[PDB]
Design a protein around this ligand. Structure first.
Ligand code: KS4
Length: 238
């Protein structure tokens, strides 16, 4: 996994803050993402951003596949938001579901699944790479599980369907926590089918063991326009 420092060229800054992320070149021939300051060495999946190489002595360098559109959150908010429509958004949701199903199967917990933590490439490829996105049992008692990730996935569906807005518009953290424990849940967002809001509701069940698996979510999302909304019609935004 270890590569020589002189094999890397750092071209453009992409982000900063703990360290930075650059776009660059590996071995003079490969566009890569470079980040400066073991799970990533074990995990492998087409919907998981792929580690390429490391420089493991301070100053440390992490080298992964390049994702050309930046974060899903940035992508949704930018020039592309205006044009995404439910079939695109449902498709991206399904890809992430697929990523998380691999994580499910491998026995890992992600713990911070949300749009800022997903990357987007060419051709709408999406890949896996604070109260408001967190399941109550996780936020309150540190019970982080795949089931709390499923909760976050529910919140990400709303980010997808509102094209990147903050969940719980106008409420502050303390307000979200209090309200959600009292049984509040986000209503159906404008022009988004009730059947998809119902999936969100399934992710936000109080009993973490009653929430759907990712394998279930992936299959539902892949099949959505044949099995669930065979008669869908694009509207003004979705
Ligand atoms: C855990 O390691 C990383 C996680 C995310 C990114 C990453 N971050 N970024 C941008 C910085 C804000 C999103 C990327 N852009 C394109 N491709 C990428 N792979 C990235 C880079 C990483 O290392 C190269």
């Amino acid at each position: 996994w270890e590569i020589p420092r002189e094999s890397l060229r750092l071209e453009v800054k992409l982000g900063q803050g703990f360290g930075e992320v650059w776009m660059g070149t590996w071995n003079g021939t490969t566009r890569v993402a470079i980040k400066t300051l073991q799970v990533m060495k074990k995990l492998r999946h087409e919907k998981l951003v792929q580690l390429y190489a490391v420089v493991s002595e301070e100053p440390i360098y992490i080298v992964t596949e390049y994702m050309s559109k930046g974060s899903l959150l940035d992508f949704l908010k930018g020039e592309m938001g205006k044009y995404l429509r439910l079939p695109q958004l449902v498709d991206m949701a399904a890809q992430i579901a697929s990523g998380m199903a691999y994580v499910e199967r491998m026995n890992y917990v992600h713990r911070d699944l949300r749009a800022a933590n997903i990357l987007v490439g060419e051709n709408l490829v999406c890949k896996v790479a604070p109260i408001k996105w967190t399941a109550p049992e996780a936020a309150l008692y540190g019970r982080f599980t795949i089931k709390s990730d499923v909760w976050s996935f529910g919140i990400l569906l709303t980010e997808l369907t509102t094209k990147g807005r903050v969940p719980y518009p106008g409420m502050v953290n303390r307000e979200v926590l209090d309200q959600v424990e009292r049984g509040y849940r986000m209503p159906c967002p404008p022009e988004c089918p009730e059947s998809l809001h119902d999936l969100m509701c399934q992710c936000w069940r109080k009993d973490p063991e009653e929430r759907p698996t990712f394998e279930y979510l992936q299959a539902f999302l892949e099949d959505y326009f044949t099995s669930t909304e065979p008669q869908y019609q694009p509207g003004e935004n979705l």
